[PDB]
Write a protein that binds this ligand. Structure first.
Ligand SMILES: CCCCCCCCCCCCCCCCCC(=O)OC[C@H](COP(=O)([O-])OCC(O)COP(=O)([O-])OC[C@@H](COC(=O)CCCCCCCCCCCCCCCCC)OC(=O)CCCCCCCCCCCCCCCCC)OC(=O)CCCCCCCCCCCCCCCCC
Ligand SMILES: COC1=C(OC)C(=O)C(C/C=C(/C)CC/C=C(/C)CC/C=C(/C)CC/C=C(\C)CC/C=C(\C)CC/C=C(\C)CC/C=C(/C)CC/C=C(/C)CC/C=C(/C)CCC=C(C)C)=C(C)C1=O
Ligand SMILES: CCCCCCCCCCCCCCCCC[C@@H](O)O[C@H](CO[C@H](O)CCCCCCCCCCCCCCC)COP(=O)(O)OCC[N+](C)(C)C
Ligand SMILES: CCCCCCCCCCCCCCCCC[C@@H](O)O[C@H](CO[C@H](O)CCCCCCCCCCCCCCC)COP(=O)(O)OCC[N+](C)(C)C
Ligand SMILES: CCCCCCCCCCCCCCCCC[C@@H](O)O[C@H](CO[C@H](O)CCCCCCCCCCCCCCC)COP(=O)(O)OCC[N+](C)(C)C
Ligand SMILES: CCCCCCCC/C=C\CCCCCCCC(=O)OC[C@H](COP(=O)(O)OCCN)OC(=O)CCCCCCC/C=C\CCCCCCCC
Ligand SMILES: CCCCCCCC/C=C\CCCCCCCC(=O)OC[C@H](COP(=O)(O)OCCN)OC(=O)CCCCCCC/C=C\CCCCCCCC
Ligand SMILES: CCCCCCCC/C=C\CCCCCCCC(=O)OC[C@H](COP(=O)(O)OCCN)OC(=O)CCCCCCC/C=C\CCCCCCCC
Ligand SMILES: CCCCCCCC/C=C\CCCCCCCC(=O)O[C@H](COC(=O)CCCCCCC/C=C/CCCCCCCC)COP(=O)(O)OCCN
Ligand SMILES: C=C(C)[C@H]1Cc2c(ccc3c2O[C@@H]2COc4cc(OC)c(OC)cc4[C@@H]2C3=O)O1
Ligand code: SF4
Lengths: 98, 115, 156, 71, 105, 175, 318, 70, 83
């Protein structure tokens, strides 16, 4: 594997790590979700272009579409949470325990 | 390679203009002069306070509608296929569902800003 | 000397640009502001001299005090004067701004805006006509022509 | 005609690389010169690292990014 | 689990896009069309367990086409020896590997 | 190794990822993701995917505009944080930069195996095709085949987008 | 020699912007029964030079509560992007020849909004924030409709290459084929360039200075130059798109003159519109774009997809 | 004026003329005066590279006619 | 017959944009299925030779296959020039 593939995979790992390690703002985590989607898009596009798989050229576009549905979903939830607390802090989501 | 040179040239020109703007004239900066502007009176609160979005649902909807232009942008190349009957059915199907999405949001009062 | 000739020419060029492009702050207090409007109207057309109004103090070169300055208002006038980048000029227009005028003996009036800010041109009248204000503006242009910042710097 | 000349151009470059490999790796312990990496014996299209591997960076850059960068 | 309704109805919802050797637009071939075709043909119908052992030659060739790891290793071993031979100075690469070639059409 | 353009672009991609993965003020985080989107567009352009790179850049510009608008409303935080404004954010940023440089160095001059496989460098130009033919763009034909081959994909994508409109309208209803 | 071409594109554009300002003042003045600049130089021909020399010798101010990096980066980004949008335009030959030039302009125009957003946010003042949020709403209003209009129009071209548009309109202007699309495209360009009656971000009567209220001297001058270069660029794009000049390969200067005349006509129409109408309300702009332009645009997109197949009029390119 | 607006429009028109004419002249000057070749697809690029190879001087623009067939 | 007319009159009086868009969309949906030229377009898209026509090996019983491009056998594009 060339250095570009490892750079893309490292980008995905950094974003996943960013998602997993929460700070305070919910939106900061939605941004890491978007970054994971972007890294997947670039990785799959590079693999598809390199092997000249013509039909697969439509799959990153599809991959983009469901990226928006996931973002629009998340932002929707971020609205409701904010409407309850006046803040998007994940500390407030502690009504339910394990 | 030519486009990279063009981008570098444009950014360099803009940055040089900023540098001339900041290093040529005589600066006399003092506290009253650098204070925030609100029409002559000091601001009450911070400008970093939450500023409500009344079009928040249109903004979320714009995300989905923006992704549909990505699906419709390859249409010029799709008109060159032999299965024009299948292609035209799919193109119209995508635009009908796009219009139906707008019809649902419109009728259910989704395009009205919150008060 | 060659250096003196160079600074004199640069001085003239900068002075020329500043006088030619004078932007007053969109700011009016009382009766005098109406005559200010008549200076911007077709008959006089201050825009033809390169004189255009701009609301922001950050994009303004000239403040025209056109109206009475009361005590309640003086901090705001001083504040928007201080937020003008330099070089900046103040034209005092009308009796009220010049010295208090009809309300000189009031408990709530500042007796002349030059107590609050430094003034370059005093335009008399109550109100001064649009032509008199235009005369004051062209006098301010003539005064800007006489400045020699570069020559002074070189001599230092 | 273009295919006929392209075949000869690719083959000539591969042969030149083979002739230079015979010289460079004369005294490498057990290097088999011109050995394939595939089990199969059928023709495999070269990778452009096989064609321009022993050449200058100018022609390598032009062969990789020449068409993409031409505007 | 997997309910094979596509096989039952002969519908082909997504099988057109599974492999790169399956009917591309304008007959554009994948980079490894021959290798994947050979590997698929060799392993057809013998089951997963048998295919893994008996079609390992075809699959190894296909993977070599996909990622070209052995090719890069061979090229690196070639250029390292060339660099060593030039650094101490007894190679002198030919003029057609330096830019002094007479190109052919 | 030639011009190191692709490697530089991928490094800037990783640096932008580190920037928004630090979890500073979202306005800043949005900027880092925009930088990453532009640089990933450049990477994809350097491989023949003009349409895909431009589309992803456009999509992420729109999404980040919506995110900026949402940040000014629901993630404002009167003293917003830049990478040097807090020890945690700066520590995460420096950790990301150091880890990327360590991985690059370990994979560059020597050939280490990190998780999956190894790398020697050689530049990404080595793995290209040499294919010489065409009055069309292969990427464009592949994307355009969505309307003739990908009928099922169009059906599921369109249904999902319509349902997404319905779903966002249901979630924010409240009551 | 390509650098010479870059400079020969950049410097004349900046000169045209400087004189566009003089032209706007003179046209608005004569439309308002006055004269406009006619003292500083003959017919005011030296007024833009005085304005530029005045703005680059005045004190630039950095606000105390502002974020400096974004505050300084935003005008640079605005001006550099405004200059970059010109490189794929064929007049009749482009500086950069792109397969997807239309997509390139779409993406860079989308990136240009962040100059206003970051400027308004980094000023850290209330009026600048209100202007930036108005920019958010404005982009949300116009973007989808503008993209779909472009696609519908380019279904007659066969590609996204801008030079092909010259070949497409060899016999007839494309405005005779898609004038309902041309009207909406023109209004969307007015919205996209933040021009009256759609100039919400500056909001002069309403928000004093809007997004750049805290900008002074050179940085403010850069914002102004970017906006006017965008006016010219968008009108040139519209002229190439809908009023296609005939190109003689042996005498390209005829095409250049024709194209420049059409671009000037469209820019003067922009200035004409600014002197005639009141300002929109920004929610009213959103409702205009989403409840009127969007349904008509969707319907016309379906019509322009079906029509070439209906009449066997599909353009050549792959 | 109203015809006093025209001088500014003429200056702007003269400024807007320059980019297109300059690009055309530079294309002619660097391309041998026979127009700049357009390569939207790899076949056109292949033709250009073949031209450069057979030109004997590494310039795609130099054209070899029927005086190379003995 | 009488309800739809009143509805159309009211819609044209209050929302002409929606009436125009619905009419244009309906025409765009319907008309392609009733056109004789829709076949021709397909034929045109089939006549464009993007890739090389690889020759067949003459087995000796292939009458309709041409031996030379100018031979009368094979597909004809005469319908296209007269169109
Ligand atoms: C990898 C490492 C990367 C190193 C980056 C450079 C090293 C860091 C320091 C330089 C940047 C900050 C300069 C500074 O703070 O001066 C303060 C200095 C004095 O500060 P002060 O007033 O005493 O203190 C005020 C407070 O600190 C309040 O100050 P503040 O709140 O304004 O400070 C914020 C600042 C403070 O700095 C930090 O927080 C740490 C630095 C983190 C930056 C990296 C974050 C990740 C961003 C994505 C990656 C970008 C690429 C980087 C790699 C490039 C490799 C070639 O962080 C930034 O805002 C940096 C933003 C630069 C991003 C440029 C992106 C352009 C986007 C264009 C659109 C997309 C195009 C398509 C693609 O003020 C000045 O010097 C005047 C203005 C200086 C800014 C000029 C423009 C920025 C300089 C170029 C940056 C890179 C552009 C490319
Ligand atoms: C209703 O009132 C109003 C008007 O009406 C009178 C206006 O005109 C108006 C518009 C503002 C005008 C006063 C125009 C201002 C003119 C510009 C700010 C000057 C910009 C000119 C330079 C910055 C361009 C650069 C100068 C060079 C000569 C160009 C070449 C560049 C080199 C590198 C070569 C406003 C806002 C207004 O409110
Ligand atoms: C159109 C776009 C392209 C333009 C092309 C030209 C590019 C122009 C460059 C842009 C900068 C314009 C600035 C012009 C004024 C000079 C400002 C500064 O550079 O000079 C002084 C630099 O001097 C400093 O004091 C440091 C001097 C020495 C210390 C480090 C310099 C080491 C260099 C060694 C010099 C010794 C002789 C060298 C001979 C080659 C700083 O003084 P300062 O007051 O702050 O700034 C305000 C300037 N005022 C006064 C005019 C208003
Ligand atoms: C058995 C199930 C029936 C009841 C349950 C319904 C649930 C399924 C939803 C809809 C089923 C349709 C999917 C069928 C697969 C489509 C592919 C196949 O049918 O052929 C296509 C036929 O497509 C035609 O356009 C007709 C089918 C399109 C139907 C219109 C969309 C309506 C779907 C509505 C339900 C989906 C969810 C709700 C959305 C409103 C194209 O074939 P063709 O192009 O010749 O040749 C391709 C091979 N080439 C490329 C090598 C040449
Ligand atoms: C490559 C170039 C880089 C720098 C570019 C900068 C722009 C070039 C310089 C342009 C200068 C043009 C402005 C000068 C015009 C003067 C107009 C003249 O009429 O002014 C007269 C007086 O002229 C001025 O005193 C001198 C002006 C010029 C001074 C020398 C300029 C030298 C320019 C050198 C450029 C150096 C650039 C340095 C940076 C590289 C008096 O008129 P005024 O009284 O108002 O009229 C009142 C109205 N009335 C008449 C109707 C009543
Ligand atoms: C984009 C279009 C325009 C681009 C900008 C081009 C501008 C070119 C013309 C510049 C004219 C010369 C600049 C003069 C103004 C600079 C600021 C100024 O006036 O300060 C005067 C200041 C007065 O200060 P002091 O006397 O020491 O005491 C005051 C403290 N109480 O004196 C000075 O510093 C003057 C020093 C000489 C200025 C240098 C001029 C050289 C020409 C600049 C060309 C720029 C090229 C980059
Ligand atoms: C001329 C003398 C040269 C001096 C160099 C100084 C540079 C510097 O950073 O100083 C900060 C300087 C002066 O500030 P003061 O100290 O307050 O006043 C000085 C007067 N005594 O401020 C500035 O002008 C900063 C200039 C901007 C930096 C230029 C480079 C920025 C690069 C931007 C890259 C991003 C571009 C975005 C768009 C591109 C995207 C496609
Ligand atoms: C910012 C994003 C810029 C987007 C650039 C897109 C330019 C473009 O589309 O031209 C494509 C052009 C030609 O392609 P086509 O004409 O479509 O077909 C090939 C046959 N001739 O392709 C190219 O030349 C690609 C060249 C490399 C792409 C440039 C990448 C630039 C990335 C910017 C990074 C700058 C520094 C990183 C941070 C910036 C600010 C901190
Ligand atoms: C067959 C193809 C169909 C698809 C093609 C059309 C493409 C896209 C067109 C539709 C896009 C989405 C439309 C969204 C529908 C809006 C619904 C709605 O909300 O309507 C009300 C209004 O009520 C209406 O719907 C308007 C009239 C009803 C619909 C319009 C006419 C329906 C069809 C008319 C044309 C039919 C064909 C023409 C016949 C010609 C005569 C022989 C909105 O008004 P308000 O916002 O509440 O106003 C408040 C301020 N006063
Ligand atoms: C901008 C142009 C072309 C004219 C209009 C104008 C000025 C200068 C100043 C002002 C102004 O209008 C605004 C709004 O209406 C009044 C009415 C006033 O009283 C009638 C009044 O007195 C202070 C002030 C104002 C504003 C004001 O300051 O020049
Ligand atoms: S000086 Fe006279 S006209 Fe002017 S504000 Fe005072 S009272 Fe009114």
């Amino acid at each position: 594997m060339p250095l570009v593939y490892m750079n893309i995979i490292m980008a995905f790992a950094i974003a996943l790590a960013g998602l997993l390690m929460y700070r305070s703002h919910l939106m900061s985590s939605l941004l890491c979700l978007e970054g994971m989607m972007l890294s997947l898009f670039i990785m799959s596009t590079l693999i598809i272009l390199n092997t000249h798989f013509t039909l697969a050229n439509m799959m990153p576009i599809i991959l983009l579409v469901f990226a928006a549905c996931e973002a629009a979903l998340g932002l929707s939830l971020l609205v409701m949470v904010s409407n309850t607390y006046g803040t998007d802090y994940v500390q407030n989501l502690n009504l339910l325990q394990c | 390679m030519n486009i990279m040179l063009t981008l570098l040239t444009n950014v360099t020109l803009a940055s040089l203009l900023v540098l001339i703007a900041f290093w040529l004239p005589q600066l006399n900066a003092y506290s009253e002069k650098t204070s925030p502007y609100e029409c002559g009176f000091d601001p009450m609160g911070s400008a970093r306070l939450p500023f409500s979005m009344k079009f928040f649902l249109v903004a979320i909807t714009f995300l989905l509608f923006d992704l549909e232009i990505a699906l419709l942008l390859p249409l010029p190349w799709a008109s060159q296929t032999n299965n024009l009957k299948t292609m035209l059915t799919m193109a119209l199907f995508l635009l009908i569902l796009l219009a139906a999405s707008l019809a649902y949001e419109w009728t259910q009062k989704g395009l009205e800003w919150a008060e | 000397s060659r250096g003196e000739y160079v600074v004199a020419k640069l001085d003239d060029l900068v002075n020329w640009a500043r006088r030619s492009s004078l932007w007053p702050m969109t700011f009016g207090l009382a009766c005098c502001a109406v005559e200010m409007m008549h200076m911007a109207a077709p008959r006089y057309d201050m825009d033809r001299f390169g004189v255009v109004f701009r609301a922001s103090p950050r994009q303004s070169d000239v403040m025209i005090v056109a109206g009475t300055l009361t005590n309640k208002m003086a901090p705001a006038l001083r504040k928007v004067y201080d937020q003008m980048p330099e070089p900046r000029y103040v034209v005092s227009m009308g009796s009220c701004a010049n010295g208090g005028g009809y309300y000189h003996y009031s408990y709530s009036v500042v007796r002349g805006c030059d107590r609050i800010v430094p003034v370059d041109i005093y335009v008399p009248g109550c109100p001064p006509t649009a032509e008199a204000l235009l005369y004051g503006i062209l006098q301010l242009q003539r005064k800007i022509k006489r400045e020699k910042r570069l020559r002074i710097w070189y001599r230092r | 005609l273009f295919q006929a000349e392209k075949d000869r151009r690719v083959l000539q470059m591969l042969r030149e690389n083979l002739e230079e490999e015979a010289i460079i790796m004369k005294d490498v312990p057990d290097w088999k010169v011109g050995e394939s990496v595939f089990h199969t014996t059928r023709w495999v299209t070269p990778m452009m690292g096989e064609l321009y591997g022993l050449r200058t960076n100018e022609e390598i850059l032009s062969a990789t990014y020449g068409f993409i960068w031409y505007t | 689990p997997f309910f094979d309704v596509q096989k039952r109805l002969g519908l082909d919802l997504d099988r057109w896009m599974t492999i790169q050797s399956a009917e591309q637009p304008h007959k554009i071939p994948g980079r490894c069309h021959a290798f994947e075709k050979e590997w698929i043909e060799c392993a057809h119908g013998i089951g997963g367990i048998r295919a893994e052992k008996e079609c390992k030659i075809e699959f190894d060739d296909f993977v070599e086409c996909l990622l070209r790891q052995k090719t890069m290793k061979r090229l690196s071993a070639i250029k390292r020896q060339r660099d060593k031979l030039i650094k101490e100075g007894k190679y002198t690469p030919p003029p057609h590997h330096l830019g002094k070639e007479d190109p052919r059409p | 190794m030639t011009m190191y353009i692709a490697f530089i672009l991928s490094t800037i991609f990783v640096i932008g990822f580190v920037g928004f993965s630090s979890k500073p003020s979202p306005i800043y985080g949005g900027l880092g993701l925009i930088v990453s989107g532009g640089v990933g567009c450049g990477i994809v352009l350097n491989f023949g995917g003009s349409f895909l790179g431009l589309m992803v850049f456009l999509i992420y510009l729109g999404g980040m505009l919506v995110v900026f608008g949402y940040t000014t409303a629901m993630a404002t935080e009167m003293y917003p944080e830049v990478w040097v404004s807090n020890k945690t954010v700066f520590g995460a940023f420096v950790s990301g930069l150091m880890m990327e440089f360590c991985m690059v160095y370990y994979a560059l001059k020597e050939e280490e195996v990190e998780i999956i496989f190894k790398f020697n460098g050689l530049g990404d130009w080595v793995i290209y095709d040499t294919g010489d033919s065409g009055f069309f763009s292969e990427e464009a034909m592949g994307i355009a085949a969505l309307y003739s081959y990908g009928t099922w994909l169009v059906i599921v994508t369109g249904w999902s987008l319509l349902i997404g409109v319905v779903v966002i309208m249901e979630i924010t209803r409240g009551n | 020699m390509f650098m010479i071409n870059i400079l020969s594109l950049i410097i004349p554009i900046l000169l045209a912007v400087a004189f566009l300002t003089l032209v706007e003042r003179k046209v608005l003045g004569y439309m308002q029964l006055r004269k406009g600049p006619n003292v500083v130089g003959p017919y005011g021909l030296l007024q833009p030079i005085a304005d530029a020399l005045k703005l680059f010798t005045k004190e630039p101010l950095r606000p105390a509560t502002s974020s400096i990096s974004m505050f300084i980066i935003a005008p640079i980004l605005a001006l550099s992007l405004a200059l970059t949008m010109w490189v794929p335009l064929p007049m009749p030959y482009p500086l950069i020849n792109m397969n997807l030039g239309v997509l390139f302009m779409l993406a860079m125009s989308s990136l240009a909004v962040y100059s206003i957003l970051w400027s308004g946010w980094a000023s850290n003042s209330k009026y600048a924030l209100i202007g930036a949020l108005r920019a958010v709403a404005q982009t949300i209003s116009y973007e989808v409709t503008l993209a779909i209009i472009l696609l519908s129009v380019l279904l007659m071209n066969g590609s996204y290459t801008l030079s092909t548009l010259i070949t497409t309109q060899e016999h007839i202007w494309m405005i005779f084929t898609s004038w309902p699309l041309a009207m909406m495209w023109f209004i969307s360009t007015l919205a996209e360039t933040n021009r009256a009656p759609f100039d919400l971000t500056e909001g002069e009567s309403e928000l004093v200075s809007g997004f750049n209220v805290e900008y002074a001297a050179g940085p403010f001058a850069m914002f102004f130059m970017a906006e006017y270069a965008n006016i010219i660029m968008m009108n040139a794009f519209t002229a190439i798109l809908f009023l296609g000049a005939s190109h003689d390969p042996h005498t390209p200067e005829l095409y250049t003159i024709n194209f420049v005349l059409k671009t000037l006509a469209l820019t003067i129409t922009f200035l004409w519109i600014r002197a005639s109408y009141p300002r929109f309300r920004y929610d009213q702009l959103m409702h205009l774009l989403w409840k009127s332009f969007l349904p008509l645009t969707l319907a016309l997109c379906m019509w322009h997809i079906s029509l070439p197949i209906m009449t066997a009029s599909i353009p050549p390119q792959s | 004026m109203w015809f006093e607006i025209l001088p500014g429009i003429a200056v702007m028109a003269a400024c807007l003329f320059i980019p297109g004419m300059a690009t055309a002249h530079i294309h002619k000057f660097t391309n041998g005066g026979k127009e700049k070749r357009v390569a939207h697809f790899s076949y056109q690029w292949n033709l250009m590279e073949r031209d450069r190879r057979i030109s004997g001087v590494n310039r795609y623009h130099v054209t070899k006619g029927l005086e190379n067939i003995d | 017959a009488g309800r739809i007319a009143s509805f159309l009159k009211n819609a044209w009086a209050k929302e002409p944009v929606l009436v125009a868009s619905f009419a244009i969309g309906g025409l765009a949906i319907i008309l392609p299925s009733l056109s004789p030229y829709t076949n021709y377009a397909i034929r045109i898209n089939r006549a464009t030779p993007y890739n090389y026509p690889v020759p067949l090996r003459d087995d000796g019983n292939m009458p309709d296959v041409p031996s030379h491009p100018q031979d009368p056998q094979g597909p004809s594009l005469e319908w296209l020039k007269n169109l």
